[PDB]
């Protein structure tokens, strides 16, 4: 079985102010276990955008149902886009660890810009 990859097929997404951005991501394996999260930015100062495991993210909807057993689609839609949303978004796989979940693989990132 090949190692899990996180595929972000789009380098750049361009969205009219007020519309919805769709940010695509696929994970190629269900192993190792752990949630997918999305961030804007890649620093230690990156901003959390979506966490599969928990949290309230009112403007984010997931394209697929992440509770389905075979799900590999981690694409999200972010609603009511404004210029403050512009930046680079990364879809990131975590594995389980102690004391907590650890980052396992990041996607290559998708630029969101606003027209």
């Amino acid at each position, epitope marked *: 079985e090949e190692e899990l*990859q996180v*595929i972000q*097929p789009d*380098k*750049s*997404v361009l969205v009219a102010a007020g519309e919805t951005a769709t940010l695509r991501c*696929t994970a190629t394996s269900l192993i190792p276990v752990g949630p997918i999260q999305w961030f804007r930015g890649a620093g230690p100062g990156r901003e959390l955008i979506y966490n599969q495991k928990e949290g309230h993210f009112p403007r984010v909807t997931t394209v697929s149902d992440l509770t389905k057993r075979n799900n590999m689609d981690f694409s999200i839609r972010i609603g009511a886009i404004t210029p403050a949303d512009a930046g680079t978004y990364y879809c990131v796989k975590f594995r389980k660890g102690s004391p907590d979940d650890v980052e396992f693989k990041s996607g*290559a*990132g998708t630029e969101l810009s606003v027209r």
Partner: T-cell receptor, first 109, second 103 residues
Framework: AVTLDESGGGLQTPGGALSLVCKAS????????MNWVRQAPGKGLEFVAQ?????????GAAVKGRATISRDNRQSTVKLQLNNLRAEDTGIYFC???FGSGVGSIDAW | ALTQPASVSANLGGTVKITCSGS???YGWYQQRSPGSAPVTVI????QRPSNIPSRFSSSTSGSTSTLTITGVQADDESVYFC?????????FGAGTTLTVLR
């Protein structure tokens, strides 16, 4: 009409450097990724470099460390600098525009 | 890496398929009539046909594979067809499939 006009090619010195330039017109230049793709004699298309609308840069394995791609949105140009040229760099180089998903999203050459 | 066959053939007026696999990204299909000449995009961003391209060209993408179909092959469809895709790590072209028109 979309145009992508290339210049800076021709004969080059082994070990030397070149600057290819592509001058675009007929579209909103800053919204597209721009690519350089080449083809050596008797071979297929080979990816060289790309710069996204957000100015992230990507290089093919065969030019890594020798290539620099840049864009100038105000002039609608993209430039490819390639140094320490060798025979394996001989070929036809095409400028190409992409819709944001890299080389699977090229619509004009 | 992207894998596509070296050659395919069809009759004039027939239907032909070319499959490329290896990426879960978006696929483009680029027609080149002779080596060194500008490619012509027949499909890009998976399944989109540029407006000047005849409707006989279509494609599907699913999983890690894409298939170009030409329905009603014409003599001017003879060419090499290159698949291209950014696979979420690198931008790659396949090695090209040559379409021969049988007669």
């Amino acid at each position: 009409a979309v145009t992508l006009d290339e210049s800076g090619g021709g004969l080059q010195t082994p070990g030397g450097a070149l600057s290819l330039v592509c001058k675009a017109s007929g579209f909103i230049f800053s919204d597209y990724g721009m690519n350089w793709v080449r083809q050596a004699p008797g071979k297929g298309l080979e990816f060289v470099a790309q710069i996204t609308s957000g100015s992230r840069t990507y290089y093919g394995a065969a030019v890594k460390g020798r290539a620099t791609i840049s864009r100038d949105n105000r002039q609608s140009t993209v430039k490819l600098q390639l140094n320490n040229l060798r025979a394996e760099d001989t070929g036809i180089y095409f400028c190409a525009r992409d819709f944001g998903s890299g080389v699977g999203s090229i619509d004009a050459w | 890496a992207l894998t596509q066959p070296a050659s395919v053939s069809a009759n004039l007026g027939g239907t032909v398929k070319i499959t490329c696999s290896g990426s879960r990204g978006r696929y483009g299909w680029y027609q080149q009539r002779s080596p060194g000449s500008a490619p012509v995009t027949v499909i890009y961003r998976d399944n989109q046909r540029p407006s000047n391209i005849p409707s006989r060209f279509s494609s599907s993408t699913s999983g890690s594979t894409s298939t170009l179909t030409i329905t009603g092959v014409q003599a001017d469809d003879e060419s090499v067809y290159f698949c291209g895709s950014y696979d979420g790590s690198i931008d790659i072209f396949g090695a090209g499939t040559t379409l021969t028109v049988l007669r």
